[PDB]
Amino acid sequence: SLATGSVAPAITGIDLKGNSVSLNDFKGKYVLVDFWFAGCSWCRKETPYLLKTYNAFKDKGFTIYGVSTDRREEDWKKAIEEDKSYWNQVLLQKDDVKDVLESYCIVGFPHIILVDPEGKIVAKELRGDDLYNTVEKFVN
Numbered sequence: 490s491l492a493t494g495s496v497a498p499a500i501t502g503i504d505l506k507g508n509s510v511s512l513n514d515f516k517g518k519y520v521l522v523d524f525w526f527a528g529c530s531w532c533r534k535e536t537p538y539l540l541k542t543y544n545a546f547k548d549k550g551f552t553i554y555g556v557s558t559d560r561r562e563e564d565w566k567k568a569i570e571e572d573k574s575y576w577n578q579v580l581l582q583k584d585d586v587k588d589v590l591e592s593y594c595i596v597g598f599p600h601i602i603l604v605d606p607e608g609k610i611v612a613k614e615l616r617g618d619d620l621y622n623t624v625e626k627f628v629n
């Protein structure tokens with residue numbers, strides 16, 4: 490991971506509507522960035538916490554930006570349907586996966602961080618109830 494206070498590096502992927510959507514698109518909002526893939530069990534198990542958080546704060550200048558490294562688009566879509574994880578979900582193009590992971594120095598998954606409205610990383614290692622409580626702290 491990167492140090493808190495770091496500027497979050499650029500990310501672009503393709504969303505479920507077939508459009509390119511970047512982290513920069515959410516400037517002005519707090520954004521939980523969730524790096525994951527379908528075969529990451531613990532990533533999937535965070536879903537209820539992510540949904541609870543998304544629902545509580547989505548009207549107050551907050552969103553979730555999910556970023557998958559799935560090699561297969563089918564696996565990614567199946568997971569989203571199974572999890573009902575219908576926030577902003579993008580899939581990295583193959584040629585971008587290594588660059589994104591290196592830029593965020595991602596070693597392990599899940600990797601869930603909180604980015605502020607100016608694009609600075611303000612929290613990391615977010616899991617479970619701590620995820621909700623951390624977002625509450627920054628958004629409220």
Ligand SMILES: N[C@@H](CCC(=O)N[C@@H](CS)C(=O)NCC(=O)O)C(=O)O
Pocket residue numbers: 490491492493594
């Ligand atoms: N601007 C940083 C970006 C690279 C970076 O942050 N690397 C990771 C390790 S791959 C790091 O040192 N992270 C510190 C942390 O996560 O606290 C640098 O060049 O050192």
Ligand SMILES: [Cl-]
Pocket residue numbers: 494495496
């Ligand atoms: Cl930085």
Ligand SMILES: [Cl-]
Pocket residue numbers: 498499500501511512513514
């Ligand atoms: Cl970006």
Ligand SMILES: [Cl-]
Pocket residue numbers: 504505506576577578579
């Ligand atoms: Cl989407």
Ligand SMILES: [Cl-]
Pocket residue numbers: 490594595596597600
């Ligand atoms: Cl990491």
Ligand SMILES: [Cl-]
Pocket residue numbers: 599600601602613614615
């Ligand atoms: Cl993390």
